[PDB]
Design a protein around this ligand. Sequence first.
Ligand SMILES: CC(C)CCN1c2nc(Nc3cc(F)c(O)c(F)c3)ncc2N(C)C(=O)C1(C)C
Length: 272
Amino acid sequence: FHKIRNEDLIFNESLGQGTFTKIFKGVRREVGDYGQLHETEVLLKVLDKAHRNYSESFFEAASMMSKLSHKHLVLNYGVCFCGDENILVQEFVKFGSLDTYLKKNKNCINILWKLEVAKQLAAAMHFLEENTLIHGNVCAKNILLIREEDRKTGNPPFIKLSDPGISITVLPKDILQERIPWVPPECIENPKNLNLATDKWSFGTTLWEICSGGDKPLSALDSQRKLQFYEDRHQLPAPKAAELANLINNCMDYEPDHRPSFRAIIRDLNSL
Ligand SMILES: CC(C)CCN1c2nc(Nc3cc(F)c(O)c(F)c3)ncc2N(C)C(=O)C1(C)C
């Protein structure tokens, strides 16, 4: 990872949190194209000091994906270790995460907008699958909205998938249970079951988020009830905008071996 000088990074407002992390907006002073100096807005992910035991998984999460370049994958700028802190520096967007965007703009987002964003997420996932790279935490909170729909130019919305954060293979059981239904049943049985098939299930859950205006599936269920949901082999309810209901259920197949390839997912989205 590129090491960003302490003097070149400034912390601004708190934006939220991730698993064992605090997230901030920041500013980075950098030499850019043609030697032009820029003050670039950045997203700062800071690992909690109390959870330093996860530093390897925290950085490995961003490192493996940073080795790849794709139009729908987040840009990583580097790391900063100012005051012994573990800080990930990534690109910043004013529009925030997809989950909050869906909720704030629920009355203005139609089926074509949802289909476009689903195709883009499926494109990123197909790229990762072709590279045999497991993501392991596909969800709308981990997706950034780069550009809003622009009807004046006919430009569609544009998204990028960010890194998965600390791996479910090292997280406490209680966190994984809270993550149902993004975490598939086989990973609840054993987190060592993390596989490319995991991402097909989580993509199904993320598509449900996209179709539900930022509602969180099973948010009314506590962890014990979330376990019962899997025990009784339930399926998520069809979203009110049900055009993608069949695809969500086909992805969220209790048999990991039967989950369709991302190439088949793209062809299904293209046939809508
Ligand atoms: C969940 C949230 C705290 C962080 C969401 N998030 C990001 N959010 C922003 N912008 C932003 C976020 C806001 F929360 C907000 O209020 C706002 F105005 C702007 N830019 C980039 C990313 N990147 C690189 C990322 O990995 C993810 C995790 C997808």
